[PDB]
Design a protein around this ligand. Structure first.
Ligand SMILES: [K+]
Ligand SMILES: [K+]
Ligand SMILES: [K+]
Ligand SMILES: [K+]
Ligand SMILES: [K+]
Ligand SMILES: [K+]
Ligand SMILES: [K+]
Ligand SMILES: [K+]
Ligand SMILES: [K+]
Ligand SMILES: [Mg+2]
Ligand SMILES: [Mg+2]
Ligand SMILES: [Mg+2]
Ligand SMILES: [Mg+2]
Ligand SMILES: [Mg+2]
Ligand SMILES: [Mg+2]
Ligand SMILES: [Mg+2]
Ligand SMILES: [Mg+2]
Ligand SMILES: [Mg+2]
Ligand SMILES: [Mg+2]
Ligand SMILES: [Mg+2]
Ligand SMILES: [Mg+2]
Ligand SMILES: [Mg+2]
Ligand SMILES: [Mg+2]
Ligand SMILES: [Mg+2]
Ligand SMILES: [Mg+2]
Ligand SMILES: [Mg+2]
Ligand SMILES: [Mg+2]
Ligand SMILES: [Mg+2]
Ligand SMILES: [Mg+2]
Ligand SMILES: [Mg+2]
Ligand SMILES: [Mg+2]
Ligand SMILES: [Mg+2]
Ligand SMILES: [Mg+2]
Ligand SMILES: [Mg+2]
Ligand SMILES: [Mg+2]
Ligand SMILES: [Mg+2]
Ligand SMILES: [Mg+2]
Ligand SMILES: [Mg+2]
Ligand SMILES: [Mg+2]
Ligand SMILES: [Mg+2]
Ligand SMILES: [Mg+2]
Ligand SMILES: [Mg+2]
Ligand SMILES: [Mg+2]
Ligand SMILES: [Mg+2]
Ligand SMILES: [Mg+2]
Ligand SMILES: [Mg+2]
Ligand SMILES: [Mg+2]
Ligand SMILES: [Mg+2]
Ligand SMILES: [Mg+2]
Ligand SMILES: [Mg+2]
Ligand SMILES: [Mg+2]
Ligand SMILES: [Mg+2]
Ligand SMILES: [Mg+2]
Ligand SMILES: [Mg+2]
Ligand SMILES: [Mg+2]
Ligand SMILES: [Mg+2]
Ligand SMILES: [Mg+2]
Ligand SMILES: [Mg+2]
Ligand SMILES: [Mg+2]
Ligand SMILES: [Mg+2]
Ligand SMILES: [Zn+2]
Lengths: 252, 58, 102
RNA sequence: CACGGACCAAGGAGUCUAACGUCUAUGCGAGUGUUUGGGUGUAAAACCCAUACGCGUAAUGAAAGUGAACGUAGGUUGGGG
RNA sequence: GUCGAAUUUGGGUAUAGGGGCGAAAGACUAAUCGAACCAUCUAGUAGCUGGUUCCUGCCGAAGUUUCCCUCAGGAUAGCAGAAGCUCGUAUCAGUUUUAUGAGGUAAAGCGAAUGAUUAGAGGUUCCGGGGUCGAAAUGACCUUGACCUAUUCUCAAACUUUAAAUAUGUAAGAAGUCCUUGUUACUUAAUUGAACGUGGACAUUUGAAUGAAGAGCUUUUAGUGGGCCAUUUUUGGUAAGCAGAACUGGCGAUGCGGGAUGAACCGAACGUAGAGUUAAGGUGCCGGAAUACACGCUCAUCAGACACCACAAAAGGUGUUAG
RNA sequence: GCCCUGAAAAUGGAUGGCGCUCAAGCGUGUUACCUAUACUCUACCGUCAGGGUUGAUAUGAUGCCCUGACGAGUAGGCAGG
RNA sequence: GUGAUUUCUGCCCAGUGCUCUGAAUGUCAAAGUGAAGAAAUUCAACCAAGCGCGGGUAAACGGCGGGAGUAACUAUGACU
RNA sequence: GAAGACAUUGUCAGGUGGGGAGUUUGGCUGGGGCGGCACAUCUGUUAAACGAUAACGCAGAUGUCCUAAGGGGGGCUCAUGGAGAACAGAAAUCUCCAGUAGAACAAAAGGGUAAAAGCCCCCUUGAUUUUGAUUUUCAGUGUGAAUACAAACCAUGAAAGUGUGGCCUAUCGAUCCUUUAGUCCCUCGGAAUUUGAGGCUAGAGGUGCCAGAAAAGUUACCACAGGGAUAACUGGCUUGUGGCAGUCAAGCGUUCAUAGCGACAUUGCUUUUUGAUUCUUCGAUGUCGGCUCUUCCUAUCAUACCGAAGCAGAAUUCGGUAA
RNA sequence: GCGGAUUUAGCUCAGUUGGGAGAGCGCCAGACUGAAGAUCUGGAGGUCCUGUGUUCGAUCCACAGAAUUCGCACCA
RNA sequence: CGCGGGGUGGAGCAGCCCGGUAGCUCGUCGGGCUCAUAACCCGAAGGUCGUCGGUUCAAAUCCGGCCCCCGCAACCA
RNA sequence: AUGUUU
């Protein structure tokens, strides 16, 4: 009879992200004339830790092409990017790790990061530590690039969308056991109030669909329809299948 | 909780307080259930007897 | 039960007013019409919000219905209705009983 | 060996209203109701009043409708006076 | 318990009631939490609990019928009051008698039907047949069985020929009886009959007894719709101060005398007094009233001592008494 | 028949108590006696009923008076205060 | 959901769920269409999703047999 | 830049929707629940010889079945037994005799029935129409069922007659709505015609909780009004059960009924068993056991003194006065 | 104790409409095999769970009892 | 109540979508082959189309009822 | 294609 925890998360009162210590939004440069037609050279000034983020950020300073001043940008650092390195961003920049290129300008098999979904959105895909997008081909007519995303999905993107050459730094991070509730605590202290998690089966019926019973048990199928409503969508939402995954992925 | 089911106790006393009344016999009782053929002819016989007894006053 | 057709019985057609032959059929209710005032009122009452606004009977106990014979006079066409006692198997056809047979 | 009550004072519970049944009193009586309102006034009183309206004088039928004396407004039996 | 990090804590800040918040106890959300607090709707509804305020006088119940989503409630009828009304040569009655019915209980019956049921005796060998012979048949037997016949012992709420007692219907007159003859479309073969009449006759007992603060009639309303007890009939139960019926009388609703005491038993029902007599019960003393009279019985190292009723049995005793 | 055996329960206790033994016990019979709000008579109160009396000084005719009977009461009704 | 590590997580997709399929597919609303009628209206065809049909899924909910005989003493039954 | 008359948005429509809202989730009842139906009914009995009459009393039955198993008429006589006839015997079919019904009549039971109410045959639709009266249940309402007529039309029989369903006693259903039949009647209210709708009369679709709501659980988180009308303790009645004790004496005891036992029976006591009941307590009598402590009972284990023995002693057993 | 159930040749069972008791696995006999097992052919096999009762008969239309089980047996 | 679909030898079945005419496989019975079974071969048996009624020179097939099963949809006495 | 044992 009560509003459940996943429903309460949407109001965003105590469930907002803890963004005080963060360096700023990690974005490519605004897609401007210089990047649309040639390239622009910036310099990496700092590689810095971002709170709540696994991958380090790179503060890259470009010259303002229209006003005498510097424009600092917060990139997600690719592995191998170092301070004092010249980053080149644009249609005519070279195929070097850390450079920002349009997806059409890179050969098939190129590994890019912080890939734009649409040209100019300043980076949407393969931003987490160790992740990357693989160019698997181009369609020059109806100019598009087919790419492989970290999740294994194949996506067709505009050939004008940009990506950063290389793989997001900080990879292998999830290979270390946290080993400690305290370490999970400090991990989520800088991300959001989503931890620790009480099992719904350990609650009362008023609190959760799984609550109640003289033994802890779901009672009904945990696979919940996609057409279910808020307060019902606890468990395995719209599960195509359950049980231990046995066999191969990448269906056709 | 179960209760009493039935008794005629005190019923005769109640009925005899105002007494069992004989049903007030009348002369000329009603002809309600009487044979309608007999009644149909009785009406005509009575109308004729009334006319005759009226005319008999000369 | 087995009820025969052709029913020589009384007719009230104001022309026969006497025993005539009657074709026997079984009464079938007939489709509930819209525009019957009860149906109109019920639809108006069910419209909008409020849910079910009249009872819906559930506690069924009868296992039979009373068959009604429609007796139609073969000459004047006037119809009469006769109710039979409750029965589980009602046939209008023939196949009369035979005695002494196998 | 059921419940309330330690004690005392004061307060403390079938009321009023709309519409009605029976009975009774009163007025008038096939009629009755002046008081919506008007006139008037010694001014929320008392007094006076037209047209209406209500109920009654007719019932019955779903309705269209029809609508109450054979007679000394009947005969018989009882009936106070 | 823990005590250097999932640590403790101040202040600021955010989340607000079917909402929040929850390392999850339905926990916490200002002593309030399985839905906070405040005000209003709201004097919410209650078939449920409690209370319901002066006197006297007269009358005076019900716990039963039917129906209900009814079983702690209501409607309905009944019981009760009040108002009376029409009459009063008069009507009737928790009663008897006479006459005439009806009943299938008590009893009774089973050498009477049905059903139970004890035993012996005659037959049936076609007895059910076996055994045994019979070379074999039932042919002889023996025999067990059955049937049949005449008997015999015992039985029945759902057996019965018979059949009470109590209880119960009707009648015992003037709205009657008798005589004559008018109506009718009914009925008859038919003025045949049926019904209703006209006219005529019969008042001392007008057709048993007893009684009759009269009889009849109407309206309208209260409370009640938990009952319980005693004798007798009676069902279930080992039984019950159990549970359920019948008739009556009671208690409830009722004091009074008696049963010490006690709702119901006995007696008797009640204005205020006086006198007398009693009821039931008592009369050694408590305690009013004979330590009366008379014939017996009893001696108990647990005597006995008034019904309801407050307990005792089978079996025994040269105790004692009488047969 | 009476008495005894049969006959064992928990606080100390009950023919009501005391006590009673040719009883003050048991069975039976006869009288006398005691006493209820009952019965009988009388008085008074009230209720009901039936009557008398508007013939005057006479003011209580719902009055005055005569006669008989009756009187329990919860819930409840009505009446007079 | 389970609950360090270690070792291991067997069988079942019949049921209830969840999910994937889609004009070859039955049913299926309003609108729209056709017919009949003077019209209200009636009837018919068509009719999306859903369901049904076909598949997957248990580290989804869950579930995971009975009787008899039988071995150089009895007993027990590898066995049928 | 992307996208594009598609999204989106608005309205309606179908699906999905315990996420949420509102509500419901019978009654009787030897407490309630489970069980059952004693809830609407029928037979016999209880039931106490008019009628009425209760229990979760007893033995059963009903929600159907039948175009004949209804109606009329005719002819015949059933169960059973005996005696006979090739196959053919206990059972086939044929024949006679006896045969009060010991058969049959749809079903439960009871009643009823013999030229029939049974069996067979013939003809039929009275299982029809109209609207009244009446009986049972009863408030003298309804419903169901039934009775006797009236007014028609029919059936059957030679006819008298009989027939308004089943030989009788059970076999069933309001308002509103729908639907059908009938009357071709009334209304659609400014006036008409035709559709449509609404009326009047009679049925059908149903309420079995059967005088007739439309209805799933859980609460060990619980709440309120109450209830000793009602359970879980004591107490009270009872004592089946439990426990204890008698009487008789077939037997055991090598003999021998009773030293000690004791069958088949039978009489009791007790209330430290458990039931049965529901009288007290639900505005509350603190609900196991133990610990502690006092007292009481005796149906006595020991101790005292004794009687008996299948008591030689010893030990033991039975019993008495004894708590 | 309440509500269900099912009882049939040695074992598992089909039954049966008012007939008449059958099929497998067993068993016996006979085949085939050198022989055994396997396999084939046959045959017997019950007084139908019990008594009584309706019956022309009727385990079967039917009445009560048993046996073996299941489920329920709760609030204190 | 509506709309659809289906019922065929013992079993599953094709047959139907405009009569020329009831078949396929297994199972069952016999023979052959084999040293003996299986497969296989040759035979033989098994239905007149769930049940009625109707159209049609002659209907499993058309047409409408009835029964049974399934799927979806519907629900004021 | 199947054909156990001594
Ligand atoms: K957790
Ligand atoms: K749960
Ligand atoms: K509505
Ligand atoms: K499954
Ligand atoms: K599944
Ligand atoms: K929901
Ligand atoms: K609830
Ligand atoms: K006892
Ligand atoms: K209590
Ligand atoms: Mg986790
Ligand atoms: Mg918990
Ligand atoms: Mg929930
Ligand atoms: Mg759920
Ligand atoms: Mg738990
Ligand atoms: Mg009562
Ligand atoms: Mg709507
Ligand atoms: Mg007391
Ligand atoms: Mg109280
Ligand atoms: Mg107090
Ligand atoms: Mg005061
Ligand atoms: Mg909890
Ligand atoms: Mg108030
Ligand atoms: Mg009195
Ligand atoms: Mg009702
Ligand atoms: Mg009360
Ligand atoms: Mg009798
Ligand atoms: Mg007798
Ligand atoms: Mg009451
Ligand atoms: Mg009282
Ligand atoms: Mg008294
Ligand atoms: Mg006494
Ligand atoms: Mg003295
Ligand atoms: Mg004696
Ligand atoms: Mg004694
Ligand atoms: Mg004395
Ligand atoms: Mg004496
Ligand atoms: Mg006196
Ligand atoms: Mg007077
Ligand atoms: Mg008085
Ligand atoms: Mg573990
Ligand atoms: Mg449509
Ligand atoms: Mg679709
Ligand atoms: Mg809900
Ligand atoms: Mg109840
Ligand atoms: Mg009687
Ligand atoms: Mg005859
Ligand atoms: Mg009836
Ligand atoms: Mg007639
Ligand atoms: Mg009859
Ligand atoms: Mg009806
Ligand atoms: Mg209508
Ligand atoms: Mg108009
Ligand atoms: Mg009722
Ligand atoms: Mg009590
Ligand atoms: Mg005993
Ligand atoms: Mg009682
Ligand atoms: Mg206390
Ligand atoms: Mg105390
Ligand atoms: Mg002793
Ligand atoms: Mg060897
Ligand atoms: Zn006609």
């Amino acid at each position: 009879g009560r509003v459940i925890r996943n429903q309460r998360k949407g109001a965003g009162s105590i469930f907002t992200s803890h963004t005080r210590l963060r360096q700023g939004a990690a974005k490519l440069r605004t897609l401007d004339y210089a990047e649309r037609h040639g390239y622009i050279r910036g310099i990496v000034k700092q590689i810095v830790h971002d709170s709540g983020r696994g991958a380090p950020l790179a503060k890259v300073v470009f010259r303002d092409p229209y006003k005498y001043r510097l424009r600092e940008e917060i990139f997600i650092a690719n592995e191998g990017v170092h301070t004092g390195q010249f980053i080149y961003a644009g249609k005519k920049a070279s195929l070097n790790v850390g450079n920002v290129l349009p997806l059409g300008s890179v050969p098939e098999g190129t590994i890019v990061s912080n890939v734009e979904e649409k040209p100019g959105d300043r980076g949407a895909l393969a931003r987490a530590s160790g992740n990357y997008v693989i160019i698997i081909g181009h369609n020059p007519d109806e100019n598009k690039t087919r790419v492989r995303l970290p999740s294994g999905a194949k996506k067709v993107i505009s050939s004008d969308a940009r990506g950063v050459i290389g793989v997001i730094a900080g990879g292998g991070r999830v290979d270390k056991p946290l080993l400690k509730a305290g370490r999970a605590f400090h991990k989520y202290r800088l991300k959001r109030n989503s931890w620790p998690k009480t099992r719904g089966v350990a609650m009362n019926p008023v609190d959760h669909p799984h609550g109640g019973g003289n033994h802890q048990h779901i009672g009904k199928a945990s696979t919940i329809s996609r057409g279910a409503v808020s307060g019902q969508k606890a468990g395995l939402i719209a599960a195509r299948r359950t049980g231990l995954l046995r066999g191969s992925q990448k269906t056709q | 909780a179960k209760s009493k089911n039935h008794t005629a106790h005190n019923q005769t006393r109640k009925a005899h307080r105002n007494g069992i009344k004989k049903p007030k016999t009348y002369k000329y009782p009603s002809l309600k259930g009487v044979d309608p053929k007999f009644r149909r002819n009785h009406k005509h016989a009575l109308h004729g007897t009334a006319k005759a007894l009226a005319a008999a006053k000369k | 039960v087995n009820v025969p057709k052709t029913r020589k019985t009384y007719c009230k057609g104001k022309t026969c007013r006497k025993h005539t032959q009657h074709k026997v059929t079984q009464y079938k209710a007939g489709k509930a019409s819209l525009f019957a005032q009860g149906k109109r009122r019920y639809d108006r009452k069910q419209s909008g919000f409020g849910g079910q606004t009249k009872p819906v009977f559930h506690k069924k106990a009868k296992t039979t219905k009373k068959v009604v014979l429609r007796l139609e006079c073969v000459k004047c066409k006037t119809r009469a209705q006769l109710t039979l006692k409750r029965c589980k198997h009602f046939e209008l056809g023939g196949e009369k009983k035979q005695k002494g047979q196998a």
